[PDB]
């Protein structure tokens, strides 16, 4: 029974639980790697005395946090648990293929571990640019193991995208149109379209890197007529859609959380929220070369990418202001999930605005490959994704488990994390403006003060992460069973109780057309 249920699953809730467990474990690995980064940088000089290892830590930090923590938690975990329940469906469209999307991830993670254990690791950056990632500057198996790790993660998510799009289009009640489905469902559908179209291009690019390394192709090698810059285009043609993939399910959860703890039956401006997510998804495919403003690009191309990138602020602003308009007039419940969501709105806004700074290619000449970029994306991506994940986790933990958290401990946890991430990353703006490069194991002495503060910040967030584990333990240790949940008339996922039965919606909902 154990193996049948947990290794052979065809159940969207159990597979979502597997994903949440996997993503939480990956988050520990990713956090430890982040502490090693900040320990190396916490005083001038060298700590590891081996900068190839430093580079390996940085590279693996990003891959773990992106591919093994955020995507599995948001899409595999919250998506599988919530999307079928939010549309009254009995499972996902392809319940057995769904299980393979899950089980491809432990092997993918194993390949990434293998990459760091063999030879001297893949010390490439998560961008894996050639020729540094090629077979002369990174001879041996490490980079190929990384490529294969990405292949398996990519297949996992492409098949998951197929599953979610099909489920969301095909398995709603017959009366429910797409404009009657909750925003989180929209956010997953749009994320899945982005995954479907972007990951195959990454797969193509990394396959070309694999063949340059092992079959004597020369896609990226000038000696054969190739071009390192072609790899960068293929990589970022995926990689900008990827950063929107990382935040869109977060936007969807934030919409639900803000609505719920405002005491509202609906988010403000629903069709504007749908429009904004679709517009962000579409524009996310036409801006990638703002990751390449210093590669030697013609001025008119820089002008186009500057302008197209800035336009994304308009739909994003509609979402931010509509969240504020959802709070407006609310019966505000100051729950820990609400705190996470309010922290999200503010810190996402800060990071989005430094992204608008960077979109200006003239300024990006001086900010590119500095800590100003690191600060931008740890606000908008690292805090954005983590705060929405924590908000969603605190909000829906009683649904998934049947048990309540201790709200006081959860609020303490939020407070510690909010101090920690701001102490860590806010000073990195100054480091970037003043010229400190990213991907450095050590820095000119002038930069000591802010690196010291940033590293002390990283330890505060470590204390928060430890406390999170204790808080989950205390909830399962005490076994406070949920009784009643308010607002079920506008939060269908709660209406089958906590936790819902293994099979839900065996008899589908009744929705008429009128």
């Amino acid at each position: 029974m154990f193996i049948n249920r947990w290794l052979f699953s065809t159940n969207h809730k159990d597979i979502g639980t597997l994903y949440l467990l996997f993503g939480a474990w990956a988050g520990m690995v990713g956090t430890a790697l982040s502490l090693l980064i900040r320990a190396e940088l916490g005083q001038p000089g060298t700590l590891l005395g081996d900068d190839q290892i430093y580079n390996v830590v940085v590279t693996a930090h990003a891959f773990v946090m992106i591919f093994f923590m955020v995507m599995p938690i948001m899409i595999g975990g919250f998506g599988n648990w919530l999307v079928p329940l939010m549309i009254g469906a009995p499972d996902m469209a392809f319940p057995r293929m769904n299980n393979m999307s899950f089980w491809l991830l432990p092997p993918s993670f194993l390949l990434l571990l293998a990459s760091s254990m063999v030879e001297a690791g893949a010390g490439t950056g998560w961008t894996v640019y050639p020729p540094l990632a090629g077979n002369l500057a990174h001879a041996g198996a490490s980079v190929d193991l990384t490529i294969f790790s990405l292949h398996l993660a990519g297949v996992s998510s492409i098949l998951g995208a197929i599953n979610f799009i099909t489920t969301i289009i095909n398995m709603k009640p017959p009366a429910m149109s797409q404009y009657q489905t909750p925003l989180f469902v929209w956010s997953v559908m749009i994320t899945a379209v982005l995954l479907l179209l972007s990951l195959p291009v990454l797969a193509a690019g990394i396959t070309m890197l694999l063949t340059d390394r092992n079959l004597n192709t020369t896609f990226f090698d000038p000696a054969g007529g190739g071009d390192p810059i072609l790899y960068q285009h293929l990589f970022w043609f995926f990689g900008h859609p990827e950063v929107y993939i990382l935040i869109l399910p977060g936007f969807g959860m934030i919409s639900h959380i803000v609505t719920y703890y405002s005491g509202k039956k609906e988010p403000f401006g629903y069709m504007g929220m749908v429009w904004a997510m679709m517009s962000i998804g579409f524009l996310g495919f036409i801006v990638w070369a703002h990751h390449m403003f210093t590669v030697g690009m013609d001025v008119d191309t820089r002008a186009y990418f500057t302008s197209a990138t800035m336009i994304i602020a308009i739909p994003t602003g509609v979402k931010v202001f509509s969240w504020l308009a959802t709070l407006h007039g609310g019966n505000i419940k100051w729950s820990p999930a609400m705190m996470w969501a309010l922290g999200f709105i503010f810190l996402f806004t800060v990071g989005g605005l430094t992204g608008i700074v960077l979109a200006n290619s003239s300024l990006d000449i001086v900010l590119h490959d500095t800590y100003y970029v690191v600060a931008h994306f740890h606000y908008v991506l690292s805090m954005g994704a983590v705060f929405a994940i924590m908000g969603g986790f605190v909000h829906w933990f009683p649904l998934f488990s049947g048990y309540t958290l201790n709200d006081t401990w959860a609020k303490i946890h939020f407070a510690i994390m909010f101090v920690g991430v701001n102490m860590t990353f806010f000073p990195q703006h100054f480091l970037g403006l003043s010229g400190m490069p990213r991907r450095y194991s050590d820095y000119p002495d002038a930069y000591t003060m802010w690196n010291t503060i940033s590293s002390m910040g990283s330890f505060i967030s470590l204390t928060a992460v430890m406390l999170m584990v204790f808080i989950i333990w205390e909830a399962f240790a005490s076994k406070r069973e949920v009784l009643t949940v308010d607002l079920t008339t506008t939060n269908l996922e709660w209406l089958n109780g906590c936790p819902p039965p293994y099979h839900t919606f065996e008899e589908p909902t009744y929705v008429n057309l009128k």
Binding site: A39, G42, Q43, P44, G45, L47, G263, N331, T408, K411, I412, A415, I416, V419, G420, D445, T448, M456, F459, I460, L462, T463, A464, L467, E481, V482, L483, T484, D486, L495, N496, G497, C498
Partner: protein
């Protein structure tokens, strides 16, 4: 009285200041005296006593508005515990400085820094605003 997990699909009671009249009474089962009280409620309410009125209220509702909206001392616990764990973090940093980190480079020695400061002034580092701008080259002292 007693809410059961197996009741999740039934209309339930809630105290919410924005949902003043919940879907069910707080207390559904009535004793003999409580039955008599509900009968008396069918006559003029001027003939109910204060205690009878409170009892009718507490059969219908669990907490009053004042009770359900009351403030608490929880913020003290939250802030104080957050500061405790932030303080604990500094213990970890102290441990790290003592047992993990070695000496920082010799360029931070006081005499090195004093010489490096002069050389930065000699090459007029940031002479418009940032650094040498703050040095008084005529009085050979930091600008006051």
């Amino acid at each position: 009285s007693v809410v059961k997990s197996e009741d999740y699909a039934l209309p339930s009671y809630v105290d919410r200041r924005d949902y003043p009249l919940p879907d069910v009474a707080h207390v559904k089962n009535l004793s003999a005296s409580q039955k008599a009280l509900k009968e008396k409620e069918k006559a003029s309410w001027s003939s109910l006593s204060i205690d009878e009125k409170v009892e009718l209220y507490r059969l219908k509702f669990k907490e009053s508005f004042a009770e359900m909206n009351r403030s608490t001392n929880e913020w003290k616990t939250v802030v104080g515990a957050a500061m405790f764990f932030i303080g604990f973090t500094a213990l970890l940093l102290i441990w790290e400085k003592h047992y993990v980190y070695g000496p920082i480079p010799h360029t931070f020695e006081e005499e090195w820094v004093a010489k490096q400061t002069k050389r930065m002034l000699d090459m007029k580092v940031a002479p418009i605003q940032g650094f040498s701008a703050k040095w008084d080259y005529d009085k050979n002292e930091w600008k006051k």
